[PDB]
């Protein structure tokens, strides 16, 4: 509003719009929908009736994140501006305290700042007195349910008044939410509409990608060979191999069916070809191009593959000495949780069961003057280093002997990474 | 605790300080600036009413906090230990490093309603 | 000469990295990792990218050193082009960090050329509307310990900045730095779907040769300042090229236990400031005997020098204290069981031969230091709470162990009996009592 | 380059603190750990550096005279603007409220407000903050010490004045929680038996030759014109013997030696002669009585009445006794060391009616002395001290050791050692 | 064990007991009642130490028995020779040393 005038600055020194820059502009998650096409009507025809008849209803939609329920209901109200209402995005997680949404509503009727207490008095005074038109989105309803359900009873008791000019639209995480957190007295007020949103399917996941790739798929750029700048000296083209786009779809629809996850794995795979193109020619920052299948093979795996195995073999010696002692106790006792003094008891014993040049160094950094150490060198350090790494876990006790230690990653992969 | 034993006690003298004086923080900050906050110097006295019911490590940690006030030279401290009985019990409970702090100028005055009838 | 002292001026600030940003030296075993960071960060400002990342690696791993190095590398040429907002998860809670952002915003505006005023959620929707919305100012976020924001209960602040990736016309970039490795499972579902999933692991010194190559680039001065420099540079590598040299020998120890450069980097700072002439310094890195004294002092009072620095009685109490501790199943022991044991032990030295057996009323004064030398612990005593409100819940709780007297607080053991035999020399008379 | 001082036994440690501290901020490391137990003179050897270095500027804070972190932030912000007033008095200032801060954001919010008006200075000056006693803060936890480490980096790094820290703490188990931050540490060792005596003689000659208790005893006895060196010898003969007859009792302390001297000194003064000033060995043989006793304890026959005395003697019976055995062995038809068991009500009067000399039936005064004994904290509740009256589940227990029971048994002629049988 | 050592001396037609004969005897009583990371570290420091003592002198032409009597006599008792054989085979695979027969052990050029 105000400060966007101050967020603008002047000197913009000719940023290089490369080949893959114009992809990521439309591969931004912003800018009719193919997948939830008919269900857009099922909201809207449920909404169009109450709007043009001055009533008060409730609409309940659920689903996993990434399915458009943040998006679709925005497309409902957007066309409605063409044809009497006040649009508010009452987000649950964007409220600091749960009562703070009450302040917004009384702010968004006349423009007054009153307390959560004093708002809902005048809100209740609004909802049963006004002679005769308010659209409210109650997003992410896991946030506003937590304390004692006294907030959630209000947001549906206002719907019961026949003289209440309000239209509520609830969007939750799960359909189960008025059956495993709320009471039945709320569950009578929630209704039984319950519009379910499933995942996306992999065919439609192809049909959502090309909507971003509408005017740019297999099109042509105008490029100078000196700076790598592309314009919608050569006239090059860039093509997208649709089969790699398909194998992006057949995984994301399989695991999650998430519309952000499908776009972003294409977005991550796009910039892999960006740096390899910049590696071969070096246009910096101041015949026919493509994106291979081998890009989305890596980037999809790049969502999966770890490093704690590679972290463990790149740790210190006494780190790998520590874990090898720790699995030795877990196969000695079979109790998966060993006392800390017994580990210090073991690393002593695992010496005497090159080793002497180790055992000299393992308890003192040379130095005859200051040798004879009980516990090993930097034993507090590696145990602190294994703690904040998340591999280990150690309960809090002022005794430094009988404080228990519990593993936090799978002990077999600890056994397996130890073998290297 | 150590905390509210300090905080209520600084509050209790502070209103007693303004009433004779004719915003601030309730801790030892007032103790050094009492020469500047109220003009004349300070000699406080501590009527510990029922001393054997208190967890003594709180009392032992309390008196070390009062030991830090000994470097300002415009304040004088005096402690009154109203025990019920059993002085030998009291030298058992405290830390021995603080008994040597206590044993500088002690006075074992007896106050009993029944003293030789 | 001051030219030797001028070399001390150069070498010290090289060991701290406080040079001007043109000559800050990155070690070779991570040059790839800064460039992919650079490819992230410089196309976020210049090419107006809006993508996030999480830095992950252990402590003291140049992570905060890498990021402001990029900023200083971009502060020289892209001055007004961006502003930075830096948040620590340590210094900021969940709710004051909103006031942390808004107050750090407005002070940039006077540097680039009504926001913090209001309630905490009043200013919250303000920075929502100021961010979601010639060229546009880009904003770089610097987050230290982002894992503590990733708690179980609310996770609000993560959810807003990650949605600012999706919708805002203002180009942003988020930089999470942490050390909890599996950071991605710590997030819930609805926040991770906002996340662009790209994390980058920080490298470690994977070969012995790597940090040897690092310390060479660390200590060598390349710019001409002192007459001593050309002499000083060849003395460094001659110690480093020889695998039998002591500096090369002691670096191998640092590769073994720590395998972390700023630990070794710490050791050199007194070693190069303790010299007063040029020739003494060259002998110091030739001898490296100061590193022995240094590792002596770092070791001198953790547990062993605690034990060596006690008198005859303090040993004799503790030696008895473990011989009681071996008998019970949990190992706990009272003060009366110690004293009784102590007396019995005493009743053996005179009969086998003149040693002042002390009273009851005095051992308490010795017993006081032994518990605050941490050679004993209380039986069920959680020592340090993790955060503030868990410690405040332990302060109001009146305790029962003080309500039993001093001589019956069931003290347990920190240093076990069998380990005492290895440290106590046989010349001491109580050596027959270490073993049972 | 710096002007180092010189002290008695910190010859290595003076070098490192001269190493890790310079007036230049770039050479100065950010955070620092001075570690050692109480009894090493770290507050001594730190200030002893600072008096020899008037070029730098030190702001001295004291956590032990505070109680919490919320005033500790108020302690910092009040003092730097207090100090910078007394360092650059020409610089104008919008003085802020140090009472206003209570949260760790607000410090770096206010230090962003403080340092910006001081930007016009001529060179990068450092400013050393000193915290003394960080472990004995009485509301400490895990996530406070790291909270003060990163305070430097939240500051703007390009300001003309740079704030850096030095932390004084003890209890080296605490430092082992934070070794992974790898901040530079200078450990301070404990002492040995000679250097305790060597420190103590050069620190206590300035009072024990100038005390009036000597100066009275000078003119009271026939004063031979003994030298100050002759006063120095008897002082040195005192110190070299008092550490010899007490070192096993005190350990390697300095504070616990600094007061035991000031208890046994005038009692030593009275037992000197005119002649034993030249005769030190026989002087110890005449003043022997104090050198084998502690004299730190400033055994009561207890005040309580007769029926309350038998009320105590029945309460000690359930120390090692249990309800499975007591009703058999006390019919009308060893845990001397161990911690006491738990009572209930009316088991007292079960044993009290038995062991009293039908001769008694009225129990009003017997109920009187119970809560009399509760105020004496000799028998206390297991639970909180509130609802113990109405018989809910409340368990009771003694808190008196065996010897005071043993004297009070014979004080009422009652025999107790028969009924304790291992 | 002295009766065990004299029975070791009873076999193989010996009238005087020998120093090697008790070694096996003890192995006996230690076995009658009964690739690690520390073994990898042992092989690593043994490879580092053998590279330093094989490259410090000028005359690289030196066999295995002279190597055994020159690196184990300045310290205490015998380390496992099969681990030294495995370390030299590891260096054979990494082309650090060349075997070239049982009479001379030389490094790479
Ligand atoms: N059918 C679609 N057509 C075009 N763009 C889409 C479609 N579905 C999702 N998107 C895009 O992907 C983003 C995903 O956000 P949404 O799925 O609307 O949020 P969501 O499903 O509610 O997940 P939340 O908000 O965390 S519960 C949208 O903001 C759009 O930018
Ligand atoms: N102002 C600074 N200039 C240059 N180097 C610095 C500065 N502050 C810290 N360092 C270096 O930072 C390194 C420590 O790594 P850091 O990234 O700062 O800490 P980290 O553990 O890696 O991440 P943090 O700080 O714990 S969130 C050391 O090598 C320091 O020399
Ligand atoms: N080298 C020395 N020369 C002279 N006096 C010394 C020396 N070292 C220590 N002292 C004395 O030792 C005393 C101990 O002072 P402190 O600094 O309080 O001891 P401490 O170990 O710091 O315990 P604290 O106060 O709890 S940190 C000082 O007051 C000095 O008088
Ligand atoms: Mg909604
Ligand atoms: Mg001190």
Curated annotation (Swiss-Prot), chain A:
Component of the origin recognition complex (ORC) composed of at least ORC1, ORC2, ORC3, ORC4, ORC5 and ORC6. Interacts with MCM10 and TAH11. Component of the origin recognition complex (ORC) that binds origins of replication. It has a role in both chromosomal replication and mating type transcriptional silencing. Binds to the ARS consensus sequence (ACS) of origins of replication. It is found in: Nucleus. It comes from Saccharomyces cerevisiae (strain ATCC 204508 / S288c) (Baker's yeast). Present with 3930 molecules/cell in log phase SD medium. ATP binds at residues 63-71, 140, 173, 260, 282-286. The N-terminus is dedicated to mating-type repression. Belongs to the ORC1 family. Mg(2+) binds at residues 139-140. This is Origin recognition complex subunit 1.
Curated annotation (Swiss-Prot), chain C:
One of its GO terms (biological process) is DNA replication initiation. InterPro entries: ORC4, ORC4_C, P-loop_NTPase. Its main location: nucleus. GO terms for molecular function: DNA replication origin binding. Gene3D superfamilies: P-loop containing nucleotide triphosphate hydrolases. Keywords: DNA replication, DNA-binding, Nucleus, Phosphoprotein. GO terms for cellular component: DNA replication preinitiation complex; nuclear origin of replication recognition complex; nuclear pre-replicative complex; nucleoplasm; nucleus. It is found in: Nucleus. The keyword DNA-binding applies. It comes from the Eukaryota. Belongs to the ORC4 family. Component of the origin recognition complex (ORC) that binds origins of replication. It has a role in both chromosomal replication and mating type transcriptional silencing. Binds to the ARS consensus sequence (ACS) of origins of replication. Component of the origin recognition complex (ORC) composed of at least ORC1, ORC2, ORC3, ORC4, ORC5 and ORC6. Present with 2170 molecules/cell in log phase SD medium. This is Origin recognition complex subunit 4. The gene is ORC4.
Curated annotation (Swiss-Prot), chain D:
It holds the Pfam family AAA_16. This is Origin recognition complex subunit 5. Belongs to the ORC5 family. One of its GO terms (cellular component) is nucleus. One of its GO terms (biological process) is DNA replication initiation. Present with 768 molecules/cell in log phase SD medium. Its main location: nucleus. Keywords: ATP-binding, DNA replication, Nucleotide-binding, Nucleus. The keyword Ribonucleoprotein does not apply. Transmembrane segments: none annotated. It is found in: Nucleus. ATP binds at residues 36-43. InterPro entries: AAA_16, ORC5, ORC5_C, ORC5_lid, P-loop_NTPase. Component of the origin recognition complex (ORC) that binds origins of replication. It has a role in both chromosomal replication and mating type transcriptional silencing. Binds to the ARS consensus sequence (ACS) of origins of replication. This subunit is a candidate for the mediation of ATP-dependent binding of ORC to origins. May also be a substrate targeting component of a cullin-RING-based E3 ubiquitin-protein ligase complex RTT101(MMS1-ORC5). Gene3D superfamilies: 1.10.8.60, P-loop containing nucleotide triphosphate hydrolases. Component of the origin recognition complex (ORC) composed of at least ORC1, ORC2, ORC3, ORC4, ORC5 and ORC6. Interacts with ORC6. Component of a cullin-RING ligase (CRL)-like complex composed of at least the cullin RTT101, a linker protein MMS1, and the potential substrate receptor ORC5. Interacts with RTT101 and MMS1. GO terms for molecular function: ATP binding; DNA replication origin binding. It comes from the Eukaryota. The gene is ORC5.
Curated annotation (Swiss-Prot), chain E:
Present with 8800 molecules/cell in log phase SD medium. Acts as a component of the MCM2-7 complex (MCM complex) which is the putative replicative helicase essential for 'once per cell cycle' DNA replication initiation and elongation in eukaryotic cells. The active ATPase sites in the MCM2-7 ring are formed through the interaction surfaces of two neighboring subunits such that a critical structure of a conserved arginine finger motif is provided in trans relative to the ATP-binding site of the Walker A box of the adjacent subunit. The six ATPase active sites, however, are likely to contribute differentially to the complex helicase activity. The lineage of its organism: Eukaryota, Fungi, Dikarya, Ascomycota, Saccharomycotina. This is DNA replication licensing factor MCM4. It comes from Saccharomyces cerevisiae (strain ATCC 204508 / S288c). Belongs to the MCM family. The gene is MCM4. Coiled coil: none annotated. It comes from the Eukaryota. Component of the MCM2-7 complex. The complex forms a toroidal hexameric ring with the proposed subunit order MCM2-MCM6-MCM4-MCM7-MCM3-MCM5; loaded onto DNA, forms a head-head double hexamer. It is found in: Nucleus.
């Amino acid at each position: 509003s105000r400060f966007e005038n101050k967020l603008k600055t002047t000197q913009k020194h000719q940023i290089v719009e490369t080949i893959f820059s114009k992809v990521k502009k439309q591969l931004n998650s912003s800018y009719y929908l193919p997948a939830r096409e008919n269900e857009f009507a099922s909201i809207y025809l449920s909404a169009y009736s109450a709007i043009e008849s001055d009533s008060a209803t409730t609409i309940y939609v659920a689903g996993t994140p990434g399915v458009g329920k943040t998006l679709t209901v925005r497309e409902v109200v957007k066309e409605l501006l063409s044809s009497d209402f006040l649009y508010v995005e009452i987000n649950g997680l964007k409220m600091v305290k749960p009562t703070d949404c009450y302040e917004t509503l009384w702010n968004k009727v006349s423009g007054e700042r009153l307390t959560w207490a004093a708002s809902m008095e005048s809100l209740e005074f609004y909802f049963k007195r006004v002679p005769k038109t308010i659209v409210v989105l109650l997003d992410e309803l896991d946030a506003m349910v937590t304390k004692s359900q006294d907030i959630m009873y209000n947001f549906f008791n206002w719907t019961t008044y026949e003289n209440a000019k309000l239209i509520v639209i609830a969007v939750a995480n799960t359909m189960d939410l008025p059956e495993r957190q709320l009471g039945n007295k709320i569950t009578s007020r929630i209704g039984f509409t319950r519009i379910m949103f499933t995942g996306y399917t992999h065919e439609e996941l192809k049909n959502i990608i090309d909507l971003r790739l509408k005017g740019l798929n297999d099109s042509f750029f105008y490029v100078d060979t000196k700076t790598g700048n592309a314009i919608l000296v050569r006239k090059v083209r860039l093509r997208m191999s649709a089969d790699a786009i398909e194998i992006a779809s057949r995984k994301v629809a399989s695991v999650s069916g998430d519309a952000r996850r499908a776009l972003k794995v294409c977005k991550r795979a796009a910039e892999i070809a960006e740096k390899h193109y910049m590696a071969k020619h070096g246009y910096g920052y101041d015949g026919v191009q493509t994106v291979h299948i081998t890009h989305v093979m890596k980037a999809l795996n790049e969502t999966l593959n770890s490093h704690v195995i590679t972290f463990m073999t790149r740790l210190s010696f006494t780190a790998k000495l520590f874990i090898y002692a720790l699995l030795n106790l877990m196969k000695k006792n079979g109790s998966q949780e060993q006392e800390l003094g017994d580990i210090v008891d073991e690393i002593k014993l695992l010496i005497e069961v090159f080793v002497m040049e180790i055992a000299k160094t393992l308890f003192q950094q040379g130095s005859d003057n200051i040798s004879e150490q009980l516990r090993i060198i930097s034993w507090d350090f590696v145990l602190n280093q294994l703690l904040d790494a998340g591999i280990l876990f150690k309960q809090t006790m002022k005794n430094d002997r009988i404080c228990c230690v519990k593993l936090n990653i799978s002990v077999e992969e600890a056994k397996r990474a130890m073998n290297e | 605790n150590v905390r509210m034993m300090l905080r209520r006690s600084m509050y209790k003298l502070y209103s007693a300080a303004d009433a004779e004086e004719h915003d601030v923080s309730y801790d030892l900050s007032l103790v050094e600036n009492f020469k500047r906050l109220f003009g004349k110097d300070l000699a406080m006295v501590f009527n510990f009413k029922d001393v054997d019911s208190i967890n003594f490590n709180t009392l032992d940690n309390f008196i070390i906090l009062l030991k830090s006030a000994f470097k300002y030279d415009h304040v004088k401290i005096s402690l009154i230990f109203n025990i019920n009985t059993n002085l030998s019990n009291i030298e058992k409970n405290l830390r021995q490093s603080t008994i040597r702090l206590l044993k500088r100028n002690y006075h074992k005055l007896d106050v009993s309603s029944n003293k030789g009838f | 000469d001051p030219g030797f002292g001028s070399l001390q001026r150069r070498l010290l600030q090289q060991l701290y990295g406080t040079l001007p940003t043109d000559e800050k030296i990155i070690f070779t075993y991570l040059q790839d990792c800064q460039q992919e960071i650079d490819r992230i960060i410089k196309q976020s400002i210049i090419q107006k990218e809006s993508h996030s990342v999480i830095l992950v690696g252990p402590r003291q791993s140049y992570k905060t050193y890498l990021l402001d190095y990029e900023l200083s590398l971009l502060q020289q040429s892209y001055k007004e082009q961006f502003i930075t907002i830096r948040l620590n998860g340590f210094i900021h809670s969940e709710q004051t960090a909103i006031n942390g952002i808004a107050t750090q915003l407005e002070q940039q505006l006077q540097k680039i050329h009504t926001i913090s005023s209001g309630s905490l959620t009043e200013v919250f929707e303000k920075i929502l509307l100021l961010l979601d919305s010639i060229t546009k100012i880009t904003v770089v976020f610097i987050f230290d310990e982002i894992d503590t924001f990733a708690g179980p209960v609310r996770q609000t602040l993560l959810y807003n900045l990650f949605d600012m990736v999706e919708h805002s016309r203002v180009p942003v970039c988020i930089f999470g730095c942490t050390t909890k490795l599996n950071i991605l499972e710590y997030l819930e579902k609805r926040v991770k779907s906002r996340f662009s999933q790209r994390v980058i692991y920080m490298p470690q010194i994977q070969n012995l040769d790597d940090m040897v190559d690092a310390v060479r680039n660390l200590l060598t001065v390349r710019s001409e300042i002192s007459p001593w420099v050309s002499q000083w540079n060849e003395t460094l590598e001659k110690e480093l090229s020889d695998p039998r040299s002591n500096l090369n020998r002691h670096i191998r120890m640092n590769f073994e236990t720590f395998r972390s450069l700023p630990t070794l980097k710490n050791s050199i700072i007194p070693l190069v400031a303790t010299s007063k002439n040029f020739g003494s310094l060259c002998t110091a890195i030739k001898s490296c005997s100061f590193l022995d004294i240094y590792n002596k002092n770092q070791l001198s009072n953790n547990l062993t020098g605690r034990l060596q620095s006690l008198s005859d009685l303090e040993l004799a109490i503790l030696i008895s204290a473990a011989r009681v501790a071996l008998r019970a199943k949990d190992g706990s022991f009272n003060f009366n069981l110690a004293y009784a044991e102590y007396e019995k032990m005493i009743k053996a030295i005179n009969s086998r031969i003149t040693i002042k057996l002390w009273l009851k009323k005095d051992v308490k004064n010795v017993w006081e230091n032994l518990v605050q030398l941490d050679f004993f612990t209380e039986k069920s005593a959680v020592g340090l709470r993790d955060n503030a409100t868990a410690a405040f819940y332990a302060s109001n709780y009146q305790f029962q162990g003080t309500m039993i007297p001093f001589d019956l607080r069931s003290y347990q053991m920190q240093i076990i009996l069998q380990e005492l035999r290895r440290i106590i020399p046989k010349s001491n008379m109580y050596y027959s009592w270490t073993q049972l | 380059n710096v002007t180092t001082p010189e002290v008695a036994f910190r010859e290595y440690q003076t070098n490192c603190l001269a190493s890790y501290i310079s007036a230049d901020p770039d050479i100065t490391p950010s955070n620092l750990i001075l570690q050692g137990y109480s009894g090493t003179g770290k507050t001594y050897t730190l200030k002893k550096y600072f008096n020899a270095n008037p070029n730098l500027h030190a702001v001295w804070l004291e956590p032990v005279e505070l109680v919490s972190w919320k005033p500790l932030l108020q302690a910092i912000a009040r003092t730097v603007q207090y100090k910078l007033k007394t360092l650059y008095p020409n610089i104008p200032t919008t003085d802020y409220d140090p009472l206003q801060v209570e949260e760790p954001f607000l410090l770096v919010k206010t230090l962003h407000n403080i340092f910006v008006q001081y930007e016009s200075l001529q060179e990068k000056t450092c400013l050393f903050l000193i915290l003394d006693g960080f472990d004995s803060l009485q509301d400490l936890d895990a996530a406070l010490f790291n909270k003060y480490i990163k305070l430097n980096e939240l500051l703007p790094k390009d300001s003309k004045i740079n704030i850096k820290f030095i932390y004084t703490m003890l209890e080296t188990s605490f430092l082992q929680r934070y070794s992974t931050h790898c901040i530079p540490t200078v450990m301070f060792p404990r002492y040995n038996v000679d250097e305790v005596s060597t420190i103590l003689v050069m620190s206590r000659c300035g009072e024990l030759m100038e005390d009036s208790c000597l100066r009275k005893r000078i003119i009271e006895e026939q004063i031979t014109d003994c030298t100050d060196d002759q006063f120095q010898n008897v002082a040195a003969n005192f110190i070299h013997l008092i550490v010899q007859a007490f070192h096993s009792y005190t350990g390697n302390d300095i504070f616990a030696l600094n007061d035991l001297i000031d208890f046994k000194w005038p009692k030593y003064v009275s037992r000197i002669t005119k002649e034993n000033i030249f005769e030190p060995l026989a002087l110890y043989k005449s003043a022997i009585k104090l050198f084998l006793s502690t004299d730190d304890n400033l055994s009561q026959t207890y005040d309580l009445s007769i029926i309350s005395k038998y009320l105590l003697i029945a309460s000690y019976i359930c120390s090692y006794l249990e309800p499975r055995y007591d009703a058999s062995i006390f019919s009308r038809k060893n845990p001397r060391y161990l911690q006491p068991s738990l009572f209930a009500i009316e088991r007292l009067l079960a044993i009290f009616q038995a062991i009293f000399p039908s001769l008694m039936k009225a129990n009003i005064e017997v109920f009187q002395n119970l809560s009399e004994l509760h105020t004496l904290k000799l028998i206390a509740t297991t639970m909180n001290k509130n609802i113990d009256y109405l018989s809910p589940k409340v368990r009771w227990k003694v808190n008196v050791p065996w010897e005071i029971i043993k004297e009070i048994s014979e004080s009422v002629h009652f025999n107790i050692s028969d009924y304790f049988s291992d | 064990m002295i009766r065990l050592a004299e029975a070791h001396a009873k076999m193989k037609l010996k009238n005087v007991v020998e120093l090697e004969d008790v070694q096996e005897a003890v192995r006996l009583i230690r076995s009658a009642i009964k690739k690690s990371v520390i073994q990898r570290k042992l092989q690593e420091d043994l490879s580092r130490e053998i590279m330093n003592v094989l490259k410090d002198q000028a005359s690289d032409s030196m066999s295995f028995n002279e190597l055994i009597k020159q690196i184990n006599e300045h310290s205490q008792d015998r380390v496992e020779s099969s681990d030294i054989q495995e370390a030299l085979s590891r260096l054979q695979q990494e082309d650090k040393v060349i075997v070239l027969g049982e009479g001379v052990r030389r490094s790479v050029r």
